[PDB]
Design a protein around this ligand. Structure first.
Ligand code: CLA
Ligand code: CLA
Ligand code: CLA
Ligand code: CLA
Ligand code: CLA
Ligand code: CLA
Ligand code: CLA
Ligand SMILES: CCCCCCCCCCCCCCCC(=O)OC[C@H](COP(=O)(O)OC[C@@H](O)CO)OC(=O)CCCCCCCCCCCCCCC
Ligand SMILES: CC1=C(/C=C/C(C)=C/C=C/C(C)=C/C=C/C=C(C)/C=C/C=C(C)/C=C/C2=C(C)CCCC2(C)C)C(C)(C)CCC1
Ligand SMILES: CC1=C(/C=C/C(C)=C/C=C/C(C)=C/C=C/C=C(C)/C=C/C=C(C)/C=C/C2=C(C)CCCC2(C)C)C(C)(C)CCC1
Ligand SMILES: CC1=C(C/C=C(\C)CCC[C@H](C)CCC[C@H](C)CCCC(C)C)C(=O)c2ccccc2C1=O
Ligand code: SF4
Ligand code: SF4
Lengths: 741, 40, 63, 140, 161, 80, 143, 31
């Protein structure tokens, strides 16, 4: 049966193993003899399966670690709400959202940093924020600072409860592996219980507190006069005054006259003209429908009662001629190995973050967020980066599963075996695809540069010399534009105005606009595809060739991350799947960097801007994307050089912090190249010279210093490279968008 | 505050963070009380 | 030089060249490097022990 | 033992793979490894995939001595099979018995083995390169 | 005075820099109303700016054609406060630091578990070493004379030449 | 092919031979060592140069030592 | 069922007998292509391959070439095709010289005489195919 | 004269280096 079964008091509570630093691993528990011990203590900190063999113990450690992480996240939600409560201008922004710059952080006057408390409107001096939390709270219906303070206190209480839960579920009552492996009940409760009831509760909150407050705010009622949420929750007369369908009660729900709730449950679509964002009635209907969908989906898998599915049987039933045994063994793999689950979950989380980035900008969900140009850019770019990082984590943990938890006795003649048996074909064909795609997509840019420099615009791959029109994307956009009448008759507007339709604008600034697709869009989209394909090549090759290869038949024996297998065979450098991830992180970094550059330039040139009373559409850069994005010279001039002005000229102003971070991120990006290009042998010899200098003075340490390991040097170089590049883009985008928008 | 927790607080990273915290606070307070000292 | 004695290594290629180590064992005949010197300073491989000959060691302190 | 192979032993049951020899083991040199198993059971090939070693005699073809030795280490340390023999097969069909050349694994000493590549002084006593400059020898 | 620079107190460019910063602060002051925390903070900040400029004028710093203070580091005692006195202060502090580290290392090397003492610092004696390193110049000189500072090189690991 | 050499600082601990993935090394009788055995390389032509012998050697400096040299199909370890 | 089995009943050869690799369609088309066709001499193999490649090589130069919007577009395309074919037959000749150094068998693509016959066939065929495509493209209004 | 750029630049920077590449490849693929 599916049952609760836990062991009591499995681990005592004591600081003795806090004092003992390297207790978790057998080798580290001995104590230090070189400084590599210190690094390995951090490297192997959360490698539970290397520490303990018991899957039960690994699961318990993971469960309590999840609790600790949730405590951290609750403290983070608390910081956001509390800073909005105290050190902010949320009330001023709520009164006047368009002119007030949102700010929820204040520096102290010590060393001249007080200038960073710039003019953000509302009689408030502080650092402008770009996280969209102000718009989030306006959507939620928060109109006072006491609400922010009290939800911050609640978040702190939840963080304390989560720390307590993490301690309790490891030191007092830890579950068993039998409890952990109840995947069917876990799926049922996560679908119906977590997602379904979360959506249902949020739909109720929206219907009862967000629709009335936001409708009154859009009407013009100032926040002081707004009736409080507790009054709105039970005052059915006021809710009938606002939405007439509420006077009918819940009888139109229990009887299936659901059409009576059409006023506050809508399928309007488009964007609200007042706030320039999605209709909150639409969002409430959305969350209600999703609650129903998830509760329906969560009753699929078997439990104590006879009804339900078995994922084992579902997988085993799917086997084809070209797949042999098919999905046999995958249920056991995913029930026994945590790394496989981590790989799948990280992949889907990253793809979801990217999909979130794509959806939020095209369909602004929060009020006055579309006009808040820094918020849109910041959220899109952030979620893109998080998505790429999660995808590479997925690849890494797939490789870890392959190295450690793979077994042919289990996975004989199944899909995993059949994939490993033609990995060579897979990687060779992806290699050809990568070469072809990169050659075409980048050589079109290079051709454009060559012909422009040769003074031959008639020979360009431009919109007027040799057109490469995205006919299929244009067709899909046309279908979406015509959808509200023909293929979605109950929809009163298009899902997103990017496909087509009217120009939504709040005050002078433009919320959303149709985004045209031409030759430059074709080129940059194929560039995106090329970058994604090369990243997939690197990561998939690392995962497939983690067990072994033609170069190293016994690569699994060496481990997951190892420096090499010597200079033999002409050199076996970075053969490890870890090193494959190390290289794929550079490539997802390049991919996401080009994606965010495309987003920034396209939205600045074609979407964001201002519209006058007559209708004079004036964009930030002036539509230069369509004619300058055809060349790498144009990318270097009209995007990087042109928009770096607001960063470099920021000294002596509130964005001077962005200027400093621009320089510092540049410095760290360059500092990374030392680790990336150099090698441990030189550094160990230099440390030997320095150690002689210290020993001459009788102060050479007992913990002998050593150059960093090879894998560690690669990791440090990659981390510094990513930090420097991402910080450079962060400062550049934030300074540019805050200055111009 | 058993001997084990005192030992843990005596560990190298905790001590580094504590001492550099005190040092940074000392420098910042000296800046507040004697600000803009581009000289002696 | 003598078991339990502190001896300075004089082998040029040793990680412990011109450094002290405690003698733990001296073997009989056979071994071209009968003395077994034990150190506390692990070399790059990790070992803290090695076999040396009597000519490659110079006593600094006796047992 | 001897420089000969039956060349008809039943092979492990394997569904094929892309990791095998490619237009060079048949032109330059192939390798074979033959062992005996007490039970028909599943193992991991050096080339990617899973195969079933048969009950009793088993024979496998490969392209690298490293691949053969890796499979041998797998067989020894998982299935405790320690009767494997490794052969090199030339395009002219000569067969050369390589790994257990004395009939016992190299890690165990034998009385008849003679030393190849042995130096009578410590490592830090080789001549300098300037001494062997413009001579065909090397400093070891 | 020297290098063609002039004292900052009698520097027209320095006075204009002060006036320009003051005008910038007063210009940004227009957004905030009288008596608010932002207004009072800006008033404090402008007072601080004027005090800083007056202090630089009084200290005797030399201002160049750019109108910024230029520190003369050549060893003349007229401009000792620019480098020489801060230099001595840092040298004393850094000596204190290094002597505390070295003396604690000398203590720890004699401990039964020096490797573990390196990570886990014996704080009661570490504080003592830090306090006692205040007199490092005499202590280092004493160790030099007694010969217990610089180990003979015939006792330090050296790579094959 | 690479040149594999063994010096008389060998202690006969027979770990290079076990680390060997190509059967290049083998223990032979020897009078010098207490264990009575010394590593030797009668099959240097099969050497690839991964230096697992050097990694596994516990001597203060390596009794077994490999010098990379003329390359071959076997030394490169090419399946083709 | 199982449509992926060992290649030629050899599990240890680096190949798989997939439908793509070993289907009757693939076998028929490949074996009937000129380079594999039974009974064709090396001269005819080269001839067929040459005409085949020469017919299509003119097109990219004709339409996407620099002088596409010029009265001599097709002439420039034909000249470009001739140049590219000259480079290709030079590549063929040097490949034969480098590969089939010492050979006397002949009548075989893997021999010097056979590869030379193949290269001659390719060269003449490709020149003729470029010219034929020129002639057809001049009179494309016929169709 | 102004003839000579046309005569010499393509001869020296298409024909001669292509022939040199052919010759070097053929020579390095001897024996
Ligand atoms: C190294 C010196 C040098 C350099 C860099 C150049 C460069 C050039 N010459 Mg040349 N040229 C040179 C010496 C040089 N020339 C000399 C001394 C003469 C004889 C007086 C000429 C006569 C000459 C004529 C008549 C013409 C050029 C032209 C050109 C241009 C096209 C390339 C060409 O086919 O020319 C090479 C033509 C030759 C007849 C071969 C000259 C042989 C020289 C001396 C070889 C020197 C080799 C060098 C030192 C090292 C080896 C290089 C390489 C193998 C690694 C180019 C700018 C053309 C032009 O004006 O285009 C706009 C053109 O029509 N050149
Ligand atoms: C309706 C019941 C229910 C609910 C609400 C949850 C909720 C959660 N489970 Mg799940 N879980 C359930 C039933 C349920 N579980 C059952 C029946 C089993 C046994 C088969 C499990 C076994 C299980 C495991 C093994 C793990 C979880 C974890 C989680 C968290 C997932 C991460 C996340 O998005 O957190 C969202 C968080 C919130 C919405 C905040 C709400 C906090 C409390 C509930 C108030 C989440 C709090 C993971 C974890 O430990 O994370 C901490 C985890 O590893 N659950
Ligand atoms: C989980 C989500 C959720 C929640 C919590 C609620 C909650 C509510 N909805 Mg519903 N509602 C939801 C989703 C949700 N809705 C959705 C998705 C829809 C769209 C289909 C609707 C559509 C809808 C309509 C159209 C209406 C409501 C209304 C109500 C009220 C019903 C009262 C009731 O049945 O008492 C249940 C009672 C019991 C189970 C018995 C126990 C009683 C306890 C002990 C009383 C406690 C009272 C309290 C603590 C003190 C109040 C004191 C006061 C002086 C302030 C309540 C505020 C009505 C309303 O008031 O609208 C404003 C109403 O007309 N809802
Ligand atoms: C759900 C998310 C998730 C989870 C649960 C895990 C879990 C794990 N990962 Mg990780 N991993 C993730 C995401 C995740 N990963 C992602 C997104 C990536 C892609 C980059 C990776 C890539 C990855 C690799 C390549 C490896 C792991 C490994 C591991 C294991 C040990 C990690 C450890 O002990 O680190 C302890 C923590 C640290 C060492 C600290 C890391 C600090 C980073 C590098 C820098 C932080 C910078 C900071 C944010 C900004 C600084 C600002 C500056 C101004 C100061 C563990 C099972 C290892 C493993 O399984 O080995 C067998 C392993 O090799 N992971
Ligand atoms: C600008 C820098 C740069 C360039 C040009 C490349 C190029 C390449 N990388 Mg990448 N790479 C880079 C930086 C770069 N990388 C960095 C910094 C890293 C370290 C993290 C890596 C790490 C890395 C890995 C690990 C992998 C790649 C891959 C590839 C290949 C992708 C296939 C492709 O599109 O090829 C086509 C060529 C281009 C796009 C270059 C321009 C081509 C145009 C058409 C010019 C043609 C000129 C003409 C024909 C010849 C010269 C004329 C005359 C002089 C004779 C290709 C060789 C992947 C691969 O193998 O792909 C199959 C792969 O696995 N790279
Ligand atoms: C215990 C303290 C200590 C002492 C006395 C010295 C002494 C020396 N170091 Mg330094 N060094 C130290 C720690 C120390 N080092 C550490 C922790 C590192 C690793 C980052 C280095 C890395 C290092 C390098 C790479 C080099 C030196 C060099 C030198 C010499 C020149 C002085 C200098 O420029 O310092 C430079 C100082 C640093 C780079 C940073 C020092 C780190 C902190 C600030 C001090 C440590 C104090 C410690 C925590 C005290 C604990 C005691 C307490 C418990 C009571 C000199 C022999 C140079 C040399 O060989 O010159 C001949 C040289 O090239 N050192
Ligand atoms: C980007 C490069 C490129 C460019 C710009 C062109 C340009 C051209 N090609 Mg194309 N071509 C290309 C690549 C390219 N080709 C490639 C890669 C191949 C091989 C796959 C071909 C194969 C090819 C053929 C075989 C023919 C062309 C022809 C043409 C012309 C078409 C316009 C015209 O006159 O219409 C007139 C269009 C026609 C008369 C119809 C031709 C259709 C052919 C016969 C297709 C095959 C039919 C059928 C499926 C055959 C079954 C098999 C049989 C054995 C033009 C010069 C045609 C030509 O020479 O025109 C005179 C022509 O017959 N091309
Ligand atoms: C692009 C690559 C297409 C070629 C590789 C696909 C080869 C392939 O994966 O094998 C064929 C495979 C279907 O195989 P079966 O029907 O045997 O497997 C069904 C499985 O779900 C049961 O295990 O996938 C597809 O048909 C995808 C076709 C490309 C769409
Ligand atoms: C029907 C139809 C069609 C077609 C379609 C198709 C052809 C499809 C295909 C599809 C496919 C072709 C699919 C696939 C899928 C896949 C999947 C779903 C996968 C999964 C995976 C996993 C889950 C994994 C995991 C892992 C990792 C990652 C690492 C480690 C290992 C493991 C295994 C754990 C069309 C269009 C005509 C239209 C109409 C209808
Ligand atoms: C399989 C397939 C495919 C493909 C196809 C193709 C690839 C085609 C091609 C086609 C072509 C590509 C055709 C061709 C034609 C040709 C021609 C029409 C030629 C002619 C020639 C001539 C007439 C020549 C002559 C001459 C001269 C003039 C001089 C002297 C020598 C000679 C006699 C040679 C597809 C995917 C689509 C679909 C599926 C199936
Ligand atoms: C700079 C560098 C070093 C030397 C750098 C080291 C050892 C890092 C120093 C870190 C310590 C902890 C200092 C941090 C700052 C405080 C002084 C403490 C390596 O050891 C190395 C190894 C392998 C590949 C590349 C490299 C590499 O690039
Ligand atoms: S530099 Fe690193 S990867 Fe290259 S051979 Fe040496 S250890 Fe291996
Ligand atoms: S020192 Fe090296 S070669 Fe000698 S026995 Fe030990 S591992 Fe073998």
């Amino acid at each position: 049966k599916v049952r609760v079964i836990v062991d009591k008091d499995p681990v005592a509570t004591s600081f003795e193993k806090w004092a003992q630093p390297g207790h978790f691993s057998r080798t580290l528990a001995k104590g230090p003899k070189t400084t590599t011990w210190i690094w390995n203590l951090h490297a192997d900190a959360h490698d539970f399966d290397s520490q303990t063999s018991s899957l039960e113990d690994i699961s318990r450690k993971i469960f309590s670690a999840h609790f600790g992480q949730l405590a951290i996240i609750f403290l983070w939600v608390s910081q956001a709400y509390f800073h909005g409560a105290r050190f902010s201008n949320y009330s001023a922004w709520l009164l006047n959202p368009t002119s007030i710059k949102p700010s929820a952080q204040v520096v102290w006057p010590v060393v001249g940093q007080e200038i960073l408390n710039g003019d953000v409107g509302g009689g408030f001096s502080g650092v402008q924020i770009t996280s969209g939390v102000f718009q989030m709270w306006r959507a939620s219906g928060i109109t006072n600072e006491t609400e922010l303070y009290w939800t911050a206190m609640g978040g702190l209480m939840m963080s304390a409860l989560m720390v307590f839960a993490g301690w309790f579920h490891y030191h007092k009552a830890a579950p068993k592996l039998e409890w952990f492996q109840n995947v069917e009940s876990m799926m049922n409760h996560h679908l119906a219980g977590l997602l379904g009831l979360g959506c249902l509760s949020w739909s109720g909150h929206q219907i009862h507190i967000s629709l009335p407050i936001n409708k009154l705010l859009d009407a013009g009622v100032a926040p002081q006069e707004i009736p409080l949420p507790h009054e709105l929750l039970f005052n059915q007369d006021l809710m009938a005054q606002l939405y007439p369908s509420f006077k009918k009660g819940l009888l139109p729900f229990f009887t299936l006259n659901w059409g009576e709730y059409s006023d506050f449950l809508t399928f309007k679509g488009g964007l609200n003209p007042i706030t320039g964002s999605l209709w909150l009635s639409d969002t409430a209907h959305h969350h209600l429908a999703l609650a129903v969908l998830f509760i329906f989906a969560g009753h699929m898998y078997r439990t104590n009662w006879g009804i339900g599915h078995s994922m084992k049987e579902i997988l085993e039933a799917h086997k084809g001629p070209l797949t042999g045994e098919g999905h046999k063994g995958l249920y056991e793999i995913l029930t026994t190995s945590w790394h496989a689950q981590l790989a799948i979950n990280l992949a889907m989380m990253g793809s979801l973050s990217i999909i979130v980035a794509h959806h939020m900008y095209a369909m602004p969900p929060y009020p006055y967020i579309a006009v808040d140009y820094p918020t849109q850019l910041s959220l899109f770019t952030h979620h893109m980066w998080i998505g790429g990082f999660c995808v590479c984590g997925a690849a890494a943990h797939g490789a870890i599963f392959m190295v450690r938890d793979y077994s042919p006795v289990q996975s004989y003649n199944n899909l995993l075996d059949r994939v490993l048996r033609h990995r060579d074909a897979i990687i060779s064909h992806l290699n050809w695809v990568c070469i072809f795609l990169g050659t075409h997509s980048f050589g079109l840019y290079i051709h454009n540069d060559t012909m422009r420099a040769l003074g031959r615009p008639q020979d360009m791959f431009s919109d007027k010399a040799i057109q490469l029109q995205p006919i299929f994307a244009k067709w899909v956009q046309s279908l979406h534009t015509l959808a509200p009448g023909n293929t979605a008759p109950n929809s009163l507007a298009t899902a997103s105005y990017a496909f087509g339709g009217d120009v939504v604008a709040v005050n002078g600034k433009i919320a959303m606009m149709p985004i045209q697709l031409g030759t430059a869009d074709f080129l940059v989209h194929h560039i995106h595809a090329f970058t994604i394909h090369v990243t997939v090549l690197i990561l998939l090759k690392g995962v497939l060739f983690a067990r072994s290869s033609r170069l190293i038949p016994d690569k699994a024996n060496l481990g997951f991350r190892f420096p090499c297998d010597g200079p033999g065979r002409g050199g076996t450098c970075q053969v490890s799947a870890w090193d494959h991830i190390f290289l794929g992180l550079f490539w997802m970094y390049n991919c996401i960097s080009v994606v965010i550059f495309h987003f920034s330039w396209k939205m600045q040139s074609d979407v964001w801007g201002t519209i006058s009373e007559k209708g004079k559409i004036t964009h930030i850069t002036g539509g230069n994307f369509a004619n300058s994005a055809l060349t790498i010279n144009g990318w270097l001039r009209d995007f990087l050089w042109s928009q770096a002005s607001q960063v470099i000229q920021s000294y002596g102003s509130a964005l001077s912090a962005y200027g400093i971070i621009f320089l510092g991120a540049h410095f760290i990006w360059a500092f990374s190249l030392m680790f990336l290009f150099s090698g441990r042998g030189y550094w160990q010899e230099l440390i030997e010279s320095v150690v002689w200098a210290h020993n001459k003075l009788k102060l050479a340490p007992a913990i002998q210093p050593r150059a960093l390991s090879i894998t560690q040097g690669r990791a440090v170089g990659l981390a510094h490279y990513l930090l420097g590049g991402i910080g450079t883009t962060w400062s550049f985008f934030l300074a540019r968008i805050i200055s111009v928008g | 505050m058993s001997k084990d927790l005192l030992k843990y607080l005596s560990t190298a990273p905790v001590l580094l963070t504590a001492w550099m915290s005190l040092t940074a606070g000392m420098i910042i307070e000296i800046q507040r009380f004697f600000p803009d000292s581009l000289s002696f | 030089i003598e078991r339990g004695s502190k001896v300075r290594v004089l082998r040029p290629e040793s990680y412990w060249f011109q450094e002290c180590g405690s003698v733990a064992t001296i073997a009989k005949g056979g071994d071209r490097y009968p003395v077994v010197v034990r150190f506390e300073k692990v070399n790059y491989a990790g070992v803290a022990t090695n076999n040396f000959a009597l000519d490659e060691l110079g006593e600094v302190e006796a047992p | 033992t001897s420089d000969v192979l039956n060349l008809q032993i039943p092979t492990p049951t394997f569904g094929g793979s892309t990791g095998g020899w490619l237009r060079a083991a048949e032109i330059e040199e192939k390798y074979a490894i033959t062992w005996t198993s007490k039970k028909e059971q599943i193992f991991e090939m050096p080339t990617s995939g899973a195969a079933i070693m048969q009950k009793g005699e088993n024979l496998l073809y490969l392209a690298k001595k490293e691949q053969c030795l890796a499979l041998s280490t797998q067989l020894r340390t998982l299935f405790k099979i320690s009767d494997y023999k490794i052969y090199r097969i030339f395009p002219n069909s000569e067969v050369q018995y390589l790994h257990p050349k004395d009939g016992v694994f190299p890690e165990k000493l034998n009385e008849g083995r003679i030393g190849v590549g042995n130096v009578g002084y410590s490592i830090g006593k080789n001549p300098n390169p300037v001494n062997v400059k413009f001579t065909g020898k090397n400093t070891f | 005075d020297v290098s063609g620079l002039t004292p900052c107190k009698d520097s027209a460019v320095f006075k204009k820099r002060l006036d320009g910063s003051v005008k910038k602060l007063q210009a940004r002051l227009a957004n905030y109303t009288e008596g608010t925390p932002a207004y009072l903070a800006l008033e404090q900040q402008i007072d601080q700016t004027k005090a800083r400029f007056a202090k630089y004028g009084d200290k005797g710093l030399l201002c160049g054609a750019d109108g910024l203070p230029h520190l003369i580091a050549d060893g003349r005692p007229d401009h000792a406060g620019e480098f020489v006195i801060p230099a001595f202060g840092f040298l004393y502090i850094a000596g204190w630091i290094g002597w505390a580290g070295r003396s604690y290392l000398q203590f720890s090397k004699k401990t039964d578990k020096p490797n573990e003492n390196e990570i886990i610092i014996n704080v009661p004696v570490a504080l003592g070493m830090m306090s006692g390193a205040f007199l490092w110049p005499l202590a280092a000189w004493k160790e030099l004379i007694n010969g217990q500072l610089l180990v003979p090189g015939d006792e330090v690991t050296v790579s094959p030449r | 092919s690479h040149s594999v050499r063994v010096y008389d600082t060998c202690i006969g601990c027979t770990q290079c031979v076990r680390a060997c993935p190509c059967d290049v090394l083998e223990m032979v009788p020897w009078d010098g060592c207490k264990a009575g055995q010394i590593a030797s390389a009668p099959r240097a032509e099969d050497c690839i140069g991964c230096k697992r012998c050097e990694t596994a050697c516990p001597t203060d400096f390596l009794s077994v030592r490999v010098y990379l040299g003329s390359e071959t199909t076997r030394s490169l370890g090419l399946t083709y | 069922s199982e449509f992926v089995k060992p290649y030629n009943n050899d599990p240890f050869v680096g190949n798989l007998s997939t439908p793509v690799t070993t289907s009757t369609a693939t076998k028929l088309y490949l074996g009937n292509l000129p380079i594999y066709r039974k009974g064709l001499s090396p001269l005819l193999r080269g001839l067929e391959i040459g005409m085949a490649h020469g017919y299509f090589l003119i097109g990219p130069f004709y339409i996407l070439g620099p002088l596409r919007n010029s009265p001599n577009a097709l002439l420039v395309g034909l000249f470009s095709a001739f140049g590219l074919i000259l480079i290709l037959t030079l590549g063929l000749t040097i490949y034969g010289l480098a590969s089939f150094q010492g050979t006397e068998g002949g009548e075989n693509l893997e021999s010097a005489k056979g590869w030379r016959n193949f290269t001659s066939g390719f060269s003449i065929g490709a020149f003729g195919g470029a010219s034929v495509a020129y002639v057809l493209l001049d009179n494309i209004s016929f169709f | 004269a102004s003839f000579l750029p046309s005569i010499l630049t393509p001869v020296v920077t298409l024909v001669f280096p292509g022939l040199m590449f052919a010759l070097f490849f053929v020579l390095i693929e001897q024996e």
